[PDB]
């Protein structure tokens, strides 16, 4: 996250970090004690670990819970050889359940209709340990940022790339603040009377925080039935 702020401990208890050959390559969100929702381009075959209850990725705070990923379910319409960032959503099953507490809490997921109503409120929070500057290094402390929704027409004019209808744009007209590489798979959430709901997955963008460009996100409303079905306990 470029131009964000340090999250306080337990401020985004649904956030998880993904570690593989490189630590903090992507983020995710807790659906429940056994399942994480992330971006399909982050995963594939390749051994991954999930860390919940994380705050500073370089200091043991005793709130962390690390788990091995035993199953990766990319959405069946995801195909990297056709488009690396379209249908960009996947689920990860954990080897053992997480223990829910003040630092490890699931994100709410409303039905399809209400997830779309909450996205249309126009203001969401994104978080992650991605780059804090364009081409810079990943964050030590979890970062967060409030990003306004950008209308589809403005979003289409911002790029030569194809923005599909179940992708959305969020960010600032003048740049300066945005999600970035290392944040993909992480959450875009909307606060509804003190309860946060998952409205998007952090997906991609051309560079980070550049004026005229926006962050591209997966609309979670498009996948609510697939998420509820595959993550049933």
């Amino acid at each position: 996250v470029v131009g964000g702020e340090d999250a306080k401990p337990g401020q985004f208890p649904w956030q998880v970090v993904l570690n593989g050959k490189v630590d903090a390559f992507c983020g995710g969100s807790i659906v429940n004690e056994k399942w994480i929702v992330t971006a399909a381009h982050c995963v594939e075959g390749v051994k991954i670990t999930v860390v919940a209850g994380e705050h500073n990725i370089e200091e043991t705070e005793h709130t962390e819970q690390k788990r091995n990923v035993i199953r990766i379910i990319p959405h069946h319409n995801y195909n990297a050889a056709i488009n690396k960032y379209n249908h960009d959503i996947a689920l990860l099953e954990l080897d053992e359940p997480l223990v829910l507490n003040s630092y490890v809490t699931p994100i709410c997921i409303a039905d399809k209709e209400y997830t779309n109503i909450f996205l249309k409120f126009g203001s969401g929070y994104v978080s992650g340990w991605g780059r804090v500057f364009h081409k810079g290094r990943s964050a030590l402390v979890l970062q967060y940022l409030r990003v306004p929704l950008v209308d589809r027409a403005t979003c289409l004019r911002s790029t030569k790339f194809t923005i599909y209808n179940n992708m959305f744009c969020a960010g600032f007209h003048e740049g300066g603040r945005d999600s970035c590489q290392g944040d993909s798979g992480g959450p875009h959430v909307t606060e509804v009377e003190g309860t946060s709901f998952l409205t998007g997955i952090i997906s991609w963008g051309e560079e980070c925080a550049m004026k005229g460009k926006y962050g591209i996100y997966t609309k979670v409303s498009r996948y609510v039935n697939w998420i509820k079905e595959k993550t049933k306990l």
């Binding site: 401990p9 337990g10 649904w14 829910l100 003040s102 809490t105 699931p106 709410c108 009377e193 003190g194």
Partner: peptide
């Protein structure tokens, strides 16, 4: 209104801020 029915309900911050 909606109120918690479990100890750690989804989407809520419970650590002191």
């Amino acid at each position: 209104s909606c109120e918690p029915a479990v100890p750690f309900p989804c989407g809520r911050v419970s650590v002191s801020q």
